[PDB]
Amino acid sequence: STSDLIPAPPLSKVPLQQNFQDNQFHGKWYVVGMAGNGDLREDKDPYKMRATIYELKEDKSYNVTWVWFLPKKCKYFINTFVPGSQPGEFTLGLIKSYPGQTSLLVRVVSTNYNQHAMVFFKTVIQNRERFYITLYGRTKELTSELKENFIRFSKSLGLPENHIVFPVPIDQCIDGSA
Ligand SMILES: O=C(O)CCCCCN1C(=O)[C@@H]2[C@H](C1=O)[C@]1(Cl)C(Cl)=C(Cl)[C@@]2(Cl)C1(Cl)Cl
Numbered sequence: 001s002t003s004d005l006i007p008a009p010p011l012s013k014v015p016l017q018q019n020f021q022d023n024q025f026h027g028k029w030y031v032v033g034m035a036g037n038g039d040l041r042e043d044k045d046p047y048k049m050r051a052t053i054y055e056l057k058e059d060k061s062y063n064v065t066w067v068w069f070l071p072k073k074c075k076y077f078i079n080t081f082v083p084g085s086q087p088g089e090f091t092l093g094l095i096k097s098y099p100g101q102t103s104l105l106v107r108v109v110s111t112n113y114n115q116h117a118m119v120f121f122k123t124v125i126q127n128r129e130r131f132y133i134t135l136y137g138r139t140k141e142l143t144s145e146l147k148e149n150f151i152r153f154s155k156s157l158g159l160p161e162n163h164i165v166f167p168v169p170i171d172q173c174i175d176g177s178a
Contacts, residue, residue, distance in 0.1 A: 006037040008129035009157045014120045017108045020088035024113035026056040030174065032142045033135030035154040035164040046132055048075070050167065051174035061093060067173050074173035081106060101125070109153065114138060116146050118153065133157070140169035 031050050036043060048068040055063040060083055068075040080093025090106035103124045111117040117136040122129055135142065135150040147166065154164050 002039060004039070004042075005128060005130070006158050006163070008037065008122060008131050011105075011107075013157060014107050015109055016086055016088040017111050020108060021113065022056055022060065022083075022087075025108070025111060025117070026054055026062075028053050028178070029117055029136035029138065030140050030169070031134060031167060032137045032140070033147060033150050033164070033166050034132065035150075035159050036132040037130060037159065037163070040163060040165065047165065047167070050170060052134075052136070053178060054081075062090070065178070067178075069170055069173045079104075109133075110149075116142055118150055131157075133159075 029052050031052075034047055034049075036046055038046075040047065045068075048070065049066055050069045051067040053065040053067075055065070057063055062081040064079055064081055066077040066079075068077075077097050079096040079098075081090035082093045084090050084106075088108040090104075092102060092104040094102075101123070105122045107120040109118045109120055115138060117134075119134050119136065120131070121134070122131045124130075133150070133154050135147065151161075151164055
């Protein structure tokens with residue numbers, strides 16, 4: 001009897017990592033966990049994304065490279081994060097590799113820079129809000145405790161168990177010389 005989208009939370013339910021350090025968040029992060037407000041039987045493209053490179057520029061924006069894994073190829077996207085109202089928050093810049101749309105809000109919820117990062121993303125598609133939570137590692141694995149913490153936060157925003165997945169780590173696309 002499903003719904004197509006879990007309603008977007010009030011941004012008062014999405015905290016920001018205190019004392020955000022832009023230079024310490026720079027570099028490569030691997031996807032350990034991903035959750036979203038779409039039915040995973042329909043919403044397939046976001047779950048192809050298995051790594052991100054965040055390159056801090058002199059102007060305090062990030063040049064952001066997204067790596068997708070497909071069974072017989074890699075795909076890559078580049079877009080620009082402009083610093084928002086508060087350290088750890090960002091909006092979309094107009095430099096990007098795809099013509100499609102203009103709207104992204106980003107909030108870094110928790111990070112210790114050398115181990116884990118948990119990031120909230122919200123976009124508007126066809127007049128309605130889509131939202132995702134990514135759990136990143138500096139390596140391809142994290143502890144039981146940190147993965148359990150991400151499940152608890154995902155559930156606090158109204159996502160059920162079957163909207164939360166931990167992909168099998170891979171070698172294709174996300175290594176290389178990147
Ligand atoms: O081609 C288009 O219109 C959109 C292609 C996606 C732009 C690049 N990009 C992104 O901007 C991000 C991640 C990403 O890959 C991912 Cl998984 C997707 Cl899809 C989007 Cl949109 C987000 Cl916000 C998320 Cl984290 Cl959900």
